[PDB]
Ligand binder design. Sequence first.
Ligand code: HEM
Length: 396
Amino acid sequence: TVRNCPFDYAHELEFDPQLRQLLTEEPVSRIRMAYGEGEAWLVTRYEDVRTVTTDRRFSRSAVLGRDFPRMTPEPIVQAESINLMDPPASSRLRGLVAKSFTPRRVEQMRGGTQRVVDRLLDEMEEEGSPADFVARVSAPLPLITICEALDIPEADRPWLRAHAMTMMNVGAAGKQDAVRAKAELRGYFQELTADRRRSPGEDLISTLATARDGDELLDDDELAVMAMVLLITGQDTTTYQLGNIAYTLLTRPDLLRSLRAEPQRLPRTLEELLRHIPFRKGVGIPRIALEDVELSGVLIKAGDVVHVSYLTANRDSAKFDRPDELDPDRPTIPHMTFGWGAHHCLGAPLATMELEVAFSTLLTRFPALRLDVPPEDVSWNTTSIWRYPLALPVTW
Ligand code: HEM
């Protein structure tokens, strides 16, 4: 009665058939994952994911100390992270970093991001066709963006990203590498944040370090971990989504033609691309039931582990008509690709702006952009919790 879920489906950007079957046939189910102990509930329907991520009887703080069902042999989350805080404690720190991503703030960052994108595309154009869109655009843009915000020295950026990637590996033998990568990244940020708290500058880390409401909002360890979390989160999914969206556009000719004909369609089209693309393998950080709760007729016991699938929520026909169709003109309904509820993505406005600047500029600068290989020759990542193309040869 307990499903085996290695969550290793990795075929292109096709939806995981196991996740689709559970959404359809067993929407609240018991699963066993690659690592951690015991079973977990898996919640798949949009309305039920909405419940689990907002109802205060499902807790992230209670995950602390558990060897919880998960996809990587060492957990990516850290003890002091915002991910493992509950409201109202999580609200104050979420509100603090959200201040750095207000609508005025990201629109004041947009000019600088436009200049980065212009330079990346200049360099790609100078090297000449064909090129790897991953190496030239999707990999560098988010790393530059978050490292400029955190004021990270350019010389350190490859080392930081390499360590973050090690933590995302699902292979069992990589556990000790992942433990070491997490410890070395934590040490880097403990030292860096201590320096910025001691001697503040005008960067984001200094802003977080000096924030007070009587006491400092972040103690020394919370500050170190928050800077580390912002680096890690800022440079993975946005890189992978730039690549996933590029592949999708370059293999959907009517959709790409529509964006070339009417570029003002891009913001709404990007929202539908985000809803549709299965950008991760499996499921992420669970929650713990704090007491017995009957979720859509299923009794979840106090202490049980509860996982949500945002990917199945995005394909729930109860919410999205013809959910497997990529339809940029469909009625607008909030998707779950940035999560939901108390832990909704803090970087969503920044990621959205990066996607809009990159693709709006790409589409006008390279009107003959095409994939330079048959789509089936594109290789897709198997080693990570994320889904992404390893390389994307393009011509123009
Ligand atoms: C297309 C790009 C992105 C996607 C699809 C994405 C998606 C997500 C998802 C699914 C979650 C988890 C929600 C949960 O735990 O239930 C999350 C959380 C988070 N994201 Fe993102 N994200 C993106 C970009 C970013 C960026 C650029 C940043 C930082 C600059 C960022 C920072 C965070 C943080 C700090 C959290 C944890 C929030 C909390 O637990 O309170 N994300 N994101």
